[PDB]
Amino acid sequence: AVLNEHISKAIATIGHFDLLTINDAGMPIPNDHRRIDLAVTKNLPRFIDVLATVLEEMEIQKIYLAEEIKEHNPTQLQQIKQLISSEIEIIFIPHEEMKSNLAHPLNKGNIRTGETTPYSNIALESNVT
Amino acid sequence: AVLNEHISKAIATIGHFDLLTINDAGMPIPNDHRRIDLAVTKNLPRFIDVLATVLEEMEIQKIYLAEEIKEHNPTQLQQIKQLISSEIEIIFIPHEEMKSNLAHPLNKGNIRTGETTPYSNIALESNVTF
Ligand SMILES: O[C@@H]1[C@H](O)[C@H](O)CO[C@H]1O
Ligand SMILES: O[C@@H]1[C@H](O)[C@H](O)CO[C@H]1O
Numbered sequence: 286a287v288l289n290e291h292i293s294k295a296i297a298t299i300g301h302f303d304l305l306t307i308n309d310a311g312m313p314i315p316n317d318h319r320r321i322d323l324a325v326t327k328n329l330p331r332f333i334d335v336l337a338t339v340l341e342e343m344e345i346q347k348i349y350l351a352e353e354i355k356e357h358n359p360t361q362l363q364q365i366k367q368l369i370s371s372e373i374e375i376i377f378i379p380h381e382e383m384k385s386n387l388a389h390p391l392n393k394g395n396i397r398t399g400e401t402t403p404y405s406n407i408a409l410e411s412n413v414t
Numbered sequence: 415a416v417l418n419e420h421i422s423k424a425i426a427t428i429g430h431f432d433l434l435t436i437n438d439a440g441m442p443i444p445n446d447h448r449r450i451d452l453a454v455t456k457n458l459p460r461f462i463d464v465l466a467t468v469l470e471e472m473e474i475q476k477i478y479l480a481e482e483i484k485e486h487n488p489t490q491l492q493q494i495k496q497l498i499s500s501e502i503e504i505i506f507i508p509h510e511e512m513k514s515n516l517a518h519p520l521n522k523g524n525i526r527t528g529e530t531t532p533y534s535n536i537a538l539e540s541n542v543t544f
Contacts (some may be wrong), residue, residue, distance in 0.1 A: 287453055322418055323418075323454060324416055338458075
């Protein structure tokens, strides 16, 4: 099995209430030890493919999305909905809040993808591991 | 233009004779400052896509490939030949030496991809950059 080293590491540091984010190419991710840059070029890797992969390696209770996704990227939102269990809660917050959450005290990592479609950003809150 | 921060930073330090490698998922890359892990899952990203991207950002004079790629992965060899110029030398060395070169003194970065097809590894040698 092939997995990202930095992602597997971060997932192992993750417990109840901890956050892990997946982001598009333009999300202003703070430059620190949480930042995990997987971007290769435009749309590689895709946000959706990285999300599908991470979800196989995690127990999630809540996800956070930009309110703006509903209007500006309904295809992404639909792709996300189709991927997650129908029991996990989806909370919509302002995109400006999604940016603050990049620096959340419980944020255990910020994954950067090559995705270029707007508001392809998510935050994943762990259940009890 | 979307770009990897690590790859971009490594290339900024690359001069004549310096090496940069792109590798498949199972290649034993030493866990140091040179390790740039882009692997997501099986065959994502593909070796050939990462190679294509990097060659746009770099001027190369030679490449190193495993002798083993001729028999064991001829389609990858053909894909590499299609990507590189005719005025760049291809040198075949044993895979064991490809592994050694991950620690070469002039190695400026080891990129790991999600590639699963065997011997999908390369080392790129820089020309004069200024
Ligand atoms: O790329 C991100 C968002 O996804 C949105 O596209 C606006 O710019 C950046 O904050
Ligand atoms: O993945 C690499 C090589 O490409 C080969 O497939 C053997 O295993 C690893 O050393």
